[PDB]
Amino acid sequence: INIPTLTLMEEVLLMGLRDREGYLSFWNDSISYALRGCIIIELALRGKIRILDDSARKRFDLSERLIEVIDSSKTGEVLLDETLQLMKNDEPLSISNWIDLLSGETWNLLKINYQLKQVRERLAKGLVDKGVLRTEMKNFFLFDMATHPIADASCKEAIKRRVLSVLVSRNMELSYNEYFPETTSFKIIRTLALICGSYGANVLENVLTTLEYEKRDKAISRAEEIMAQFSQYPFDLEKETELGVSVNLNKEVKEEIENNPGHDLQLEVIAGVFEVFSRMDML
Amino acid sequence: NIPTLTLMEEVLLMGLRDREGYLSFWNDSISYALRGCIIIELALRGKIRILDDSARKRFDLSERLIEVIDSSKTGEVLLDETLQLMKNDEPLSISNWIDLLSGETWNLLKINYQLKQVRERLAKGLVDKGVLRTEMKNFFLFDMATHPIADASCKEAIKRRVLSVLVSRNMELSYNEYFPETTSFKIIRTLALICGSYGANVLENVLTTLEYEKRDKAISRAEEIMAQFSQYPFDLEKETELGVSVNLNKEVKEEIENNPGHDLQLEVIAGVFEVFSRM
Amino acid sequence: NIPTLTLMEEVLLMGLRDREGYLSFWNDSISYALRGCIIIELALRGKIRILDDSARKRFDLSERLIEVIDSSKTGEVLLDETLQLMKNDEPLSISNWIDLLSGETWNLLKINYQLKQVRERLAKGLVDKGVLRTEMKNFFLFDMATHPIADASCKEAIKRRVLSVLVSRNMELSYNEYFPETTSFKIIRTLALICGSYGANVLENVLTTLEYEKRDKAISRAEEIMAQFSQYPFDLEKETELGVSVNLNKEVKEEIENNPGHDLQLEVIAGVFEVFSRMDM
Amino acid sequence: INIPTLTLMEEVLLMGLRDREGYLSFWNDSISYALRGCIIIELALRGKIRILDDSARKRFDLSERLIEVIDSSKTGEVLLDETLQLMKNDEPLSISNWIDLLSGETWNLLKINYQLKQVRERLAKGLVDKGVLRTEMKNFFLFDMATHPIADASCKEAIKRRVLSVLVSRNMELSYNEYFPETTSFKIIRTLALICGSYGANVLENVLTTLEYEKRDKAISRAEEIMAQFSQYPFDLEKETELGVSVNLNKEVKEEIENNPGHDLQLEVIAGVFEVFSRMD
């Protein structure tokens, strides 16, 4: 009711999905990794984790700070739940340390089973069961493959429109649908999450390509600004943009945080993940 | 005595490009024709024969009943699966068998023995025999087993055999590991390929590079041989105005003479040829 | 009047991201599609033509043989290399060539026919033409040359063409230094961009921002064109019920009425377009 | 026989990568400078150089002392061999001097192709030849590129373990492997050399990021101590650590030198480089 229908993991997949012949969409070591960022961002907004409140942490990069489990009760998201399981039964590890373990970018034989298998297909069963995707068989010469064509095109359309509202509107005014109601906690935070996630996942640009290039360039930049601003805690909400895009982002984000108080330890985790998204070139 | 690939496998190959991917989308023309192949194959392996009544003659070839001669395993899954059903049943006609195994007739009591998972099972066959290999392609929302081809010469052999029968004026089939010199009914088997792969509509797939006059002559040579060999006894008297295959008669007469007392089998293979032309 | 980029260049550009282009999606589809482009290009340049034997008409366009009518160097390494191959071989079919040039065939005496270094040479092209600069990015154990984009207006103009055919009620193409109102078969070349692009699965790339209905309409209009022009002579009399580029027919007809004499060349084009159609396989 | 598979400079470079693919570091002047130090520490350790046995030296900082080539026979290690070759055919220079020369920080008109170049690339080839990573072609959208993901992942774990064994655990029990056998001479010095090389190079923190905060800090301090300690000669194996980490160091190092006798002219050089490591800004 305050948690929206789709997980950020799902939204990013959609940002990657083609309209026609979607199994032929581009899958790569980037999207895969960024979905793990997402898993942790998500768990943060859901109040399951927070950074460990040790003032020592302030001497270390945001992405290297340890986090702890506030709350280990099932979310109903299989992907989230399973990582929550791993987290419950272990010492506090750092954000990138978790993102790495869950992606198996890490190489200690000790924590082999920490890596999440079947993300794409479980993410797609989710998209199917939620009605965003259909399921139909295409018969190739030697086999049939299950195909998951878009069932509801209006779903991704709103995702896209939220991005556009933040990266091309001069004034961010966000549209709410059944999937993403006005009564959604941290709605802008979550939109900024989706953008940065998509950016790291290397699918942000997909959503802008029809625009004239000045507008596409500006958008990319805007995202990069947002990524700077929100990849440090407390968020700099004072650096007004020189770009003339979402000129109201600071006022609204401020208000959003104001109305949603005493959550900094969770908002910090997010700047952490946002930091990780910045350093994704290094894969 | 027995070749490595079953005709069913040979026809499947005929549907694929030389490397990865395919030519025909898997339609149910090919699917039916493959069943025909099983029945010929069974007849060639001396497992089945045309029911040795003379009352059979009041009826077209494909309306004639077959009787299990020999129910011992073949080693080929699809083949054995059909032998299974056949041993446990009335003598049924060629036509009917083909229909039942394709599931293009309807029978209430006959517990439904359309052959499921054919194409996918033939695939496995072809992997296990080293024709096809298995490649893991990562797609956006799942992973996928794929089978691009492993041994290209296998297809060359088949192509060359086919073109030996329908472009060159003198047939001299060539032999290899898969299809050795010592194979029983060598020529009847490549005719069966040609005829099967014709109703399957995959025959043209090998003609695609030939000079245009050769393409027409091959296509019409095919249907020529395709009616010679769908009546019984086989007409090995009538020769051809086309400049192809001109020794096929001599050579089939000689192939049969050397392999005596199988008439009750060839007749089945003929009746299957009949279903091919009728499709 | 031959425009500045090859159709292969334009296809590559359709698949090229704005930032970190070197991480754009590469794959067998775009790769094979580049070859069909080569053939189209050659027919558009008077270098090849359909082998003028009526026996052909009993068969599919894509399987009709083509012949070298003018083997003089073209000035494009890729086009030219394939002209050398063609010049000194017997007549071979449209799909047979694309197969040979794409590596797609297991033929003994012709493994050497495969054009290697195609991407590299193509970026060389887009550099020497000023669409792409060239700049070193430093990783840890090495440095790689990247070619970020120098002139964004190039892909833009291409994009605006596709959009003019695929979303405007009335197509009205626009010209630039690269693609002048001067140029031969302006519309065919466009339809070629589109159909080639679609075969490469890089068509929908440019339509992403559009409202989902306009987008969906755009793809199926693209499919109309695909069938319309993958038979010869072109079906220029069947009109469209999507109410988009409703004048395409009138305009192609005019484009063909002016510039007569290349019947045997246009056919090659329709042949390649047929290959484009069968690309799922 | 008693010299290990990897050079410290391979090991320092290895500290620079992420476990499977990717990097933790953008290449830079620090890692570069340190690797030259490494070349020396190594050349000393191999009985290829001593300090020049002169009294005047004691009036001079360890790094401004001259070094003498006691032998110049090929090491098999290509960077060592080239710098050995420069050293052979030259007058004794300060250790600090060579590092500068070798990394091209100073300029000498008599000696202007003295800087080791194509370091990275040669270093990786080594690492590939030795089995410690492999080589995958990646097919980006405009070119091919040869990359080098880790092959043997345990090699780099062995190392993290050693470093960690002296900078984090209370007692120190070095854990030996196929790459770094128990029979390798100056087992513990080299471990220390790595720790110091790493530090100068700014890749030491990379092995530490996963730990608890106290552990991270204590590790860094302990490495700084170790550095202070072994940048003077003879080593103060008397100074005791109040950090409660790696408390058996002295005893073991003592025991270690007490097992390699008559190598003081070498070991001194080592201190001379440790001194250079801790003067990088």
JSON list of N, CA and C in Angstrom, two decimals, chain C residues 11-13 15-16 21-26 30 117 119-120 123 132 138-147, chain D residues 12-13 16-17 23 25-28 31 120-121 124 127 133 138-148 203:
[
{"chain": "C", "resi": 11, "resn": "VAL", "atom": "N", "xyz": [23.30, 1.31, -40.69]},
{"chain": "C", "resi": 11, "resn": "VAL", "atom": "CA", "xyz": [22.83, 0.25, -39.82]},
{"chain": "C", "resi": 11, "resn": "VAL", "atom": "C", "xyz": [23.64, 0.27, -38.52]},
{"chain": "C", "resi": 12, "resn": "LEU", "atom": "N", "xyz": [24.98, 0.20, -38.60]},
{"chain": "C", "resi": 12, "resn": "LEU", "atom": "CA", "xyz": [25.84, 0.27, -37.40]},
{"chain": "C", "resi": 12, "resn": "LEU", "atom": "C", "xyz": [25.52, 1.42, -36.47]},
{"chain": "C", "resi": 13, "resn": "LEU", "atom": "N", "xyz": [25.24, 2.57, -37.07]},
{"chain": "C", "resi": 13, "resn": "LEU", "atom": "CA", "xyz": [24.87, 3.73, -36.30]},
{"chain": "C", "resi": 13, "resn": "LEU", "atom": "C", "xyz": [23.55, 3.52, -35.58]},
{"chain": "C", "resi": 15, "resn": "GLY", "atom": "N", "xyz": [22.54, 0.96, -34.22]},
{"chain": "C", "resi": 15, "resn": "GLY", "atom": "CA", "xyz": [22.82, 0.19, -33.03]},
{"chain": "C", "resi": 15, "resn": "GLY", "atom": "C", "xyz": [23.82, 0.79, -32.04]},
{"chain": "C", "resi": 16, "resn": "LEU", "atom": "N", "xyz": [24.28, 2.01, -32.31]},
{"chain": "C", "resi": 16, "resn": "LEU", "atom": "CA", "xyz": [25.32, 2.67, -31.51]},
{"chain": "C", "resi": 16, "resn": "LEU", "atom": "C", "xyz": [24.81, 3.61, -30.38]},
{"chain": "C", "resi": 21, "resn": "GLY", "atom": "N", "xyz": [30.01, 3.90, -26.64]},
{"chain": "C", "resi": 21, "resn": "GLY", "atom": "CA", "xyz": [29.51, 3.19, -27.81]},
{"chain": "C", "resi": 21, "resn": "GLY", "atom": "C", "xyz": [30.08, 1.80, -27.87]},
{"chain": "C", "resi": 22, "resn": "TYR", "atom": "N", "xyz": [31.32, 1.65, -27.42]},
{"chain": "C", "resi": 22, "resn": "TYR", "atom": "CA", "xyz": [31.98, 0.34, -27.49]},
{"chain": "C", "resi": 22, "resn": "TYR", "atom": "C", "xyz": [31.23, -0.75, -26.67]},
{"chain": "C", "resi": 23, "resn": "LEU", "atom": "N", "xyz": [30.30, -0.35, -25.82]},
{"chain": "C", "resi": 23, "resn": "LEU", "atom": "CA", "xyz": [29.51, -1.33, -25.10]},
{"chain": "C", "resi": 23, "resn": "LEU", "atom": "C", "xyz": [28.10, -1.57, -25.68]},
{"chain": "C", "resi": 24, "resn": "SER", "atom": "N", "xyz": [27.90, -1.17, -26.94]},
{"chain": "C", "resi": 24, "resn": "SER", "atom": "CA", "xyz": [26.63, -1.38, -27.60]},
{"chain": "C", "resi": 24, "resn": "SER", "atom": "C", "xyz": [26.49, -2.86, -27.86]},
{"chain": "C", "resi": 25, "resn": "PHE", "atom": "N", "xyz": [25.27, -3.31, -28.11]},
{"chain": "C", "resi": 25, "resn": "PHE", "atom": "CA", "xyz": [24.97, -4.74, -28.33]},
{"chain": "C", "resi": 25, "resn": "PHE", "atom": "C", "xyz": [25.47, -5.18, -29.71]},
{"chain": "C", "resi": 26, "resn": "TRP", "atom": "N", "xyz": [26.36, -6.15, -29.76]},
{"chain": "C", "resi": 26, "resn": "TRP", "atom": "CA", "xyz": [26.77, -6.76, -31.03]},
{"chain": "C", "resi": 26, "resn": "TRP", "atom": "C", "xyz": [26.29, -8.21, -31.05]},
{"chain": "C", "resi": 30, "resn": "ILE", "atom": "N", "xyz": [22.84, -8.30, -36.43]},
{"chain": "C", "resi": 30, "resn": "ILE", "atom": "CA", "xyz": [23.38, -7.12, -37.06]},
{"chain": "C", "resi": 30, "resn": "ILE", "atom": "C", "xyz": [24.52, -7.51, -38.03]},
{"chain": "C", "resi": 117, "resn": "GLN", "atom": "N", "xyz": [37.08, -8.39, -40.20]},
{"chain": "C", "resi": 117, "resn": "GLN", "atom": "CA", "xyz": [37.37, -6.98, -39.82]},
{"chain": "C", "resi": 117, "resn": "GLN", "atom": "C", "xyz": [36.31, -5.95, -40.21]},
{"chain": "C", "resi": 119, "resn": "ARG", "atom": "N", "xyz": [33.38, -4.70, -38.62]},
{"chain": "C", "resi": 119, "resn": "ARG", "atom": "CA", "xyz": [33.16, -3.65, -37.60]},
{"chain": "C", "resi": 119, "resn": "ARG", "atom": "C", "xyz": [34.27, -2.58, -37.54]},
{"chain": "C", "resi": 120, "resn": "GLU", "atom": "N", "xyz": [35.52, -3.06, -37.57]},
{"chain": "C", "resi": 120, "resn": "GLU", "atom": "CA", "xyz": [36.72, -2.24, -37.42]},
{"chain": "C", "resi": 120, "resn": "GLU", "atom": "C", "xyz": [36.79, -1.29, -38.59]},
{"chain": "C", "resi": 123, "resn": "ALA", "atom": "N", "xyz": [34.06, 1.41, -38.46]},
{"chain": "C", "resi": 123, "resn": "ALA", "atom": "CA", "xyz": [34.31, 2.51, -37.56]},
{"chain": "C", "resi": 123, "resn": "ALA", "atom": "C", "xyz": [35.41, 3.39, -38.15]},
{"chain": "C", "resi": 132, "resn": "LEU", "atom": "N", "xyz": [32.57, 10.00, -36.04]},
{"chain": "C", "resi": 132, "resn": "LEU", "atom": "CA", "xyz": [33.16, 9.51, -34.81]},
{"chain": "C", "resi": 132, "resn": "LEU", "atom": "C", "xyz": [34.55, 10.09, -34.68]},
{"chain": "C", "resi": 138, "resn": "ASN", "atom": "N", "xyz": [41.56, 4.66, -20.47]},
{"chain": "C", "resi": 138, "resn": "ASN", "atom": "CA", "xyz": [42.50, 3.83, -19.70]},
{"chain": "C", "resi": 138, "resn": "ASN", "atom": "C", "xyz": [41.79, 2.93, -18.68]},
{"chain": "C", "resi": 139, "resn": "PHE", "atom": "N", "xyz": [41.91, 1.62, -18.87]},
{"chain": "C", "resi": 139, "resn": "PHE", "atom": "CA", "xyz": [41.54, 0.64, -17.85]},
{"chain": "C", "resi": 139, "resn": "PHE", "atom": "C", "xyz": [42.82, 0.31, -17.00]},
{"chain": "C", "resi": 140, "resn": "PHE", "atom": "N", "xyz": [42.80, -0.80, -16.26]},
{"chain": "C", "resi": 140, "resn": "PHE", "atom": "CA", "xyz": [43.97, -1.11, -15.45]},
{"chain": "C", "resi": 140, "resn": "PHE", "atom": "C", "xyz": [45.12, -1.68, -16.30]},
{"chain": "C", "resi": 141, "resn": "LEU", "atom": "N", "xyz": [45.00, -2.93, -16.77]},
{"chain": "C", "resi": 141, "resn": "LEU", "atom": "CA", "xyz": [46.09, -3.62, -17.47]},
{"chain": "C", "resi": 141, "resn": "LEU", "atom": "C", "xyz": [46.27, -3.26, -18.93]},
{"chain": "C", "resi": 142, "resn": "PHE", "atom": "N", "xyz": [45.58, -2.21, -19.40]},
{"chain": "C", "resi": 142, "resn": "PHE", "atom": "CA", "xyz": [45.63, -1.83, -20.82]},
{"chain": "C", "resi": 142, "resn": "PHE", "atom": "C", "xyz": [44.85, -0.56, -21.12]},
{"chain": "C", "resi": 143, "resn": "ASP", "atom": "N", "xyz": [45.08, -0.06, -22.33]},
{"chain": "C", "resi": 143, "resn": "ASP", "atom": "CA", "xyz": [44.37, 1.07, -22.88]},
{"chain": "C", "resi": 143, "resn": "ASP", "atom": "C", "xyz": [43.69, 0.62, -24.17]},
{"chain": "C", "resi": 144, "resn": "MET", "atom": "N", "xyz": [42.41, 0.93, -24.31]},
{"chain": "C", "resi": 144, "resn": "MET", "atom": "CA", "xyz": [41.70, 0.65, -25.55]},
{"chain": "C", "resi": 144, "resn": "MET", "atom": "C", "xyz": [41.31, 1.95, -26.25]},
{"chain": "C", "resi": 145, "resn": "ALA", "atom": "N", "xyz": [41.40, 1.97, -27.57]},
{"chain": "C", "resi": 145, "resn": "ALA", "atom": "CA", "xyz": [40.88, 3.10, -28.34]},
{"chain": "C", "resi": 145, "resn": "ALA", "atom": "C", "xyz": [39.34, 3.04, -28.43]},
{"chain": "C", "resi": 146, "resn": "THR", "atom": "N", "xyz": [38.68, 4.08, -27.93]},
{"chain": "C", "resi": 146, "resn": "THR", "atom": "CA", "xyz": [37.26, 4.25, -28.12]},
{"chain": "C", "resi": 146, "resn": "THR", "atom": "C", "xyz": [37.01, 5.26, -29.24]},
{"chain": "C", "resi": 147, "resn": "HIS", "atom": "N", "xyz": [35.84, 5.20, -29.86]},
{"chain": "C", "resi": 147, "resn": "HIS", "atom": "CA", "xyz": [35.49, 6.18, -30.85]},
{"chain": "C", "resi": 147, "resn": "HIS", "atom": "C", "xyz": [34.20, 6.82, -30.45]},
{"chain": "D", "resi": 12, "resn": "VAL", "atom": "N", "xyz": [52.11, -7.30, -6.67]},
{"chain": "D", "resi": 12, "resn": "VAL", "atom": "CA", "xyz": [51.53, -5.99, -6.42]},
{"chain": "D", "resi": 12, "resn": "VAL", "atom": "C", "xyz": [50.45, -5.72, -7.46]},
{"chain": "D", "resi": 13, "resn": "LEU", "atom": "N", "xyz": [50.76, -5.97, -8.72]},
{"chain": "D", "resi": 13, "resn": "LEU", "atom": "CA", "xyz": [49.76, -5.83, -9.76]},
{"chain": "D", "resi": 13, "resn": "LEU", "atom": "C", "xyz": [48.51, -6.64, -9.42]},
{"chain": "D", "resi": 16, "resn": "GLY", "atom": "N", "xyz": [45.84, -5.40, -7.47]},
{"chain": "D", "resi": 16, "resn": "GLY", "atom": "CA", "xyz": [45.14, -4.33, -8.15]},
{"chain": "D", "resi": 16, "resn": "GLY", "atom": "C", "xyz": [43.83, -4.71, -8.83]},
{"chain": "D", "resi": 17, "resn": "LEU", "atom": "N", "xyz": [43.53, -6.00, -8.94]},
{"chain": "D", "resi": 17, "resn": "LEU", "atom": "CA", "xyz": [42.39, -6.47, -9.72]},
{"chain": "D", "resi": 17, "resn": "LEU", "atom": "C", "xyz": [41.26, -6.88, -8.80]},
{"chain": "D", "resi": 23, "resn": "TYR", "atom": "N", "xyz": [38.44, -4.32, -12.32]},
{"chain": "D", "resi": 23, "resn": "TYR", "atom": "CA", "xyz": [39.54, -3.80, -11.52]},
{"chain": "D", "resi": 23, "resn": "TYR", "atom": "C", "xyz": [39.04, -2.97, -10.34]},
{"chain": "D", "resi": 25, "resn": "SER", "atom": "N", "xyz": [41.16, -0.47, -9.29]},
{"chain": "D", "resi": 25, "resn": "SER", "atom": "CA", "xyz": [42.10, 0.64, -9.39]},
{"chain": "D", "resi": 25, "resn": "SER", "atom": "C", "xyz": [42.19, 1.13, -10.82]},
{"chain": "D", "resi": 26, "resn": "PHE", "atom": "N", "xyz": [42.21, 2.45, -10.98]},
{"chain": "D", "resi": 26, "resn": "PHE", "atom": "CA", "xyz": [42.57, 3.04, -12.26]},
{"chain": "D", "resi": 26, "resn": "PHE", "atom": "C", "xyz": [44.10, 3.16, -12.20]},
{"chain": "D", "resi": 27, "resn": "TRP", "atom": "N", "xyz": [44.80, 2.71, -13.24]},
{"chain": "D", "resi": 27, "resn": "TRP", "atom": "CA", "xyz": [46.27, 2.73, -13.24]},
{"chain": "D", "resi": 27, "resn": "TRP", "atom": "C", "xyz": [46.81, 4.14, -13.06]},
{"chain": "D", "resi": 28, "resn": "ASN", "atom": "N", "xyz": [47.97, 4.28, -12.41]},
{"chain": "D", "resi": 28, "resn": "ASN", "atom": "CA", "xyz": [48.49, 5.60, -12.03]},
{"chain": "D", "resi": 28, "resn": "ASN", "atom": "C", "xyz": [49.99, 5.64, -11.69]},
{"chain": "D", "resi": 31, "resn": "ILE", "atom": "N", "xyz": [51.32, 3.16, -8.13]},
{"chain": "D", "resi": 31, "resn": "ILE", "atom": "CA", "xyz": [51.52, 1.79, -8.52]},
{"chain": "D", "resi": 31, "resn": "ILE", "atom": "C", "xyz": [52.74, 1.67, -9.46]},
{"chain": "D", "resi": 120, "resn": "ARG", "atom": "N", "xyz": [52.94, -2.82, -17.71]},
{"chain": "D", "resi": 120, "resn": "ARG", "atom": "CA", "xyz": [51.64, -3.48, -17.66]},
{"chain": "D", "resi": 120, "resn": "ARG", "atom": "C", "xyz": [51.54, -4.73, -18.55]},
{"chain": "D", "resi": 121, "resn": "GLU", "atom": "N", "xyz": [51.75, -4.51, -19.85]},
{"chain": "D", "resi": 121, "resn": "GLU", "atom": "CA", "xyz": [51.56, -5.53, -20.86]},
{"chain": "D", "resi": 121, "resn": "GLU", "atom": "C", "xyz": [52.50, -6.69, -20.65]},
{"chain": "D", "resi": 124, "resn": "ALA", "atom": "N", "xyz": [51.46, -8.67, -17.48]},
{"chain": "D", "resi": 124, "resn": "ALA", "atom": "CA", "xyz": [50.30, -9.54, -17.67]},
{"chain": "D", "resi": 124, "resn": "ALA", "atom": "C", "xyz": [50.69, -10.79, -18.46]},
{"chain": "D", "resi": 127, "resn": "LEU", "atom": "N", "xyz": [52.04, -13.08, -16.15]},
{"chain": "D", "resi": 127, "resn": "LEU", "atom": "CA", "xyz": [50.97, -13.62, -15.34]},
{"chain": "D", "resi": 127, "resn": "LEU", "atom": "C", "xyz": [50.11, -14.64, -16.07]},
{"chain": "D", "resi": 133, "resn": "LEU", "atom": "N", "xyz": [46.45, -15.89, -14.63]},
{"chain": "D", "resi": 133, "resn": "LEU", "atom": "CA", "xyz": [45.21, -15.59, -15.34]},
{"chain": "D", "resi": 133, "resn": "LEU", "atom": "C", "xyz": [45.28, -16.04, -16.79]},
{"chain": "D", "resi": 138, "resn": "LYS", "atom": "N", "xyz": [36.89, -10.43, -26.09]},
{"chain": "D", "resi": 138, "resn": "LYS", "atom": "CA", "xyz": [35.57, -9.88, -25.89]},
{"chain": "D", "resi": 138, "resn": "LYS", "atom": "C", "xyz": [35.25, -9.21, -27.22]},
{"chain": "D", "resi": 139, "resn": "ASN", "atom": "N", "xyz": [33.98, -9.27, -27.62]},
{"chain": "D", "resi": 139, "resn": "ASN", "atom": "CA", "xyz": [33.55, -8.71, -28.89]},
{"chain": "D", "resi": 139, "resn": "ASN", "atom": "C", "xyz": [32.68, -7.47, -28.71]},
{"chain": "D", "resi": 140, "resn": "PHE", "atom": "N", "xyz": [33.32, -6.34, -28.40]},
{"chain": "D", "resi": 140, "resn": "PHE", "atom": "CA", "xyz": [32.62, -5.06, -28.34]},
{"chain": "D", "resi": 140, "resn": "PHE", "atom": "C", "xyz": [32.13, -4.63, -29.71]},
{"chain": "D", "resi": 141, "resn": "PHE", "atom": "N", "xyz": [31.46, -3.48, -29.77]},
{"chain": "D", "resi": 141, "resn": "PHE", "atom": "CA", "xyz": [30.56, -3.17, -30.87]},
{"chain": "D", "resi": 141, "resn": "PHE", "atom": "C", "xyz": [31.32, -2.57, -32.05]},
{"chain": "D", "resi": 142, "resn": "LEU", "atom": "N", "xyz": [32.54, -2.13, -31.79]},
{"chain": "D", "resi": 142, "resn": "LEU", "atom": "CA", "xyz": [33.38, -1.54, -32.83]},
{"chain": "D", "resi": 142, "resn": "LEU", "atom": "C", "xyz": [34.73, -2.22, -32.98]},
{"chain": "D", "resi": 143, "resn": "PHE", "atom": "N", "xyz": [35.07, -3.16, -32.11]},
{"chain": "D", "resi": 143, "resn": "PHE", "atom": "CA", "xyz": [36.34, -3.88, -32.23]},
{"chain": "D", "resi": 143, "resn": "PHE", "atom": "C", "xyz": [36.38, -5.13, -31.35]},
{"chain": "D", "resi": 144, "resn": "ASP", "atom": "N", "xyz": [37.46, -5.90, -31.47]},
{"chain": "D", "resi": 144, "resn": "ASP", "atom": "CA", "xyz": [37.74, -6.99, -30.56]},
{"chain": "D", "resi": 144, "resn": "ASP", "atom": "C", "xyz": [38.77, -6.51, -29.58]},
{"chain": "D", "resi": 145, "resn": "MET", "atom": "N", "xyz": [38.79, -7.10, -28.40]},
{"chain": "D", "resi": 145, "resn": "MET", "atom": "CA", "xyz": [39.74, -6.69, -27.37]},
{"chain": "D", "resi": 145, "resn": "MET", "atom": "C", "xyz": [40.11, -7.92, -26.55]},
{"chain": "D", "resi": 146, "resn": "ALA", "atom": "N", "xyz": [41.42, -8.12, -26.33]},
{"chain": "D", "resi": 146, "resn": "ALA", "atom": "CA", "xyz": [41.88, -9.25, -25.53]},
{"chain": "D", "resi": 146, "resn": "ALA", "atom": "C", "xyz": [41.92, -8.87, -24.06]},
{"chain": "D", "resi": 147, "resn": "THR", "atom": "N", "xyz": [41.14, -9.56, -23.24]},
{"chain": "D", "resi": 147, "resn": "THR", "atom": "CA", "xyz": [41.14, -9.29, -21.79]},
{"chain": "D", "resi": 147, "resn": "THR", "atom": "C", "xyz": [41.74, -10.45, -21.02]},
{"chain": "D", "resi": 148, "resn": "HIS", "atom": "N", "xyz": [41.99, -10.23, -19.73]},
{"chain": "D", "resi": 148, "resn": "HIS", "atom": "CA", "xyz": [42.72, -11.22, -18.96]},
{"chain": "D", "resi": 148, "resn": "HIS", "atom": "C", "xyz": [42.06, -11.50, -17.62]},
{"chain": "D", "resi": 203, "resn": "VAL", "atom": "N", "xyz": [47.56, -0.02, -3.25]},
{"chain": "D", "resi": 203, "resn": "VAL", "atom": "CA", "xyz": [46.63, -1.10, -3.46]},
{"chain": "D", "resi": 203, "resn": "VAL", "atom": "C", "xyz": [46.52, -1.95, -2.20]}
]
